[PDB]
Assembly symmetry: C2
Homo-oligomer: 188 residues x 2
């Protein structure tokens, strides 16, 4: 059985917990994860100054698609950088067109708004990103910790990151793989 | 009021979630955190292949002590590397002698055993690290998600990392700072 593949797009100002937790949990599930630097291959300064080194540039990772999921971490500045990128636009439009999963957390869903992705969907965000996301009425808002409307999967914050990551694993690899990955984590 | 200071010792094979979550949460609390590379300043490959760039080498960070807390992430290989380091030994002995906090998660507490730190204390670990930690009977074991016996603070796994980090914040900066840092996280 071929391994599923995930693209995690890492921009300056990304929320580092929301980057690392999904990467780690997806890799535990046997997903081949590419941490792709929006800016290139150089290390990325996250929202609380953790510095993460990409596996590859987004420019190169874009050429090795398609991916079973495209993951957008949060962080206000990270999400703004994702929102400004034409490369990200192209990747997300292609992913929607091919009926592939898109997963975004905290402020990350606001890049879906910027790139006109998933309009009409029910979404959640961090509470502090609600009004940016809802500007223009292009979505329906949800309070759920993880929200999934077809292939638009959204979540709220650092404290929903494990739930978000496990939801991605379940969507890709099924319930039993997600449950097996969950138990050694010592979640409550 | 002078900012409290934390030393997070980052070794090859460290559990990346257990590194990032405490760093991020402590920084949210206004703690000045130094992510110190055991090996030097070069990027560190974690247990699930996330690569984190240290702020400084342990060699240099050791010279800018003392620190209000020394934090030991888990990961089997990370903890083994911490356990083999004479520099880590010296830092932990100094921290115990000065009545400073030591915080270790998952397999991280097994470096306390290696360095003869805190013998007699009640500790927890990841379940899979229990028998390494208990070899020789130098500690008393606990099932609590976070365990604190004086200035020996231990915890169990990725899924206890927020609890662990908030316990460190509470110990350093008090209950109200920890509660203020907690709410925007969207923990359950």
């Amino acid at each position: 059985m071929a391994s599923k593949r995930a693209l995690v797009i890492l921009a300056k100002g990304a929320q580092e917990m929301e980057t690392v937790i999904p990467v780690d949990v997806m890799r535990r599930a046997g997903i081949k994860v590419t941490v792709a630097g929006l800016a290139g291959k150089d290390p990325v300064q996250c929202s609380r100054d953790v510095v993460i080194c990409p596996d590859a540039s987004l420019e190169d990772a874009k050429k090795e698609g398609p991916y079973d999921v495209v993951v957008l971490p949060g962080g206000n500045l990270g999400a703004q950088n994702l929102s400004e990128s034409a490369a990200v636009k192209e990747i997300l439009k292609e992913q929607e067109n091919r009926k592939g999963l898109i997963a975004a957390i905290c402020a990350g869903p606001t890049a879906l708004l910027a790139h006109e992705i998933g309009f009409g969907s029910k979404v959640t965000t961090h509470p502090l990103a609600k009004d940016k996301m809802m500007n223009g009425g292009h979505y329906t808002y949800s309070e759920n910790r993880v929200e999934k409307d077809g292939l638009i999967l959204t979540s709220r914050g650092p404290g929903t990151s494990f739930e978000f990551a496990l939801a991605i694993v379940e969507a890709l690899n099924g319930k039993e793989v997600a449950a097996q990955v969950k138990a050694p984590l010592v979640l409550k």
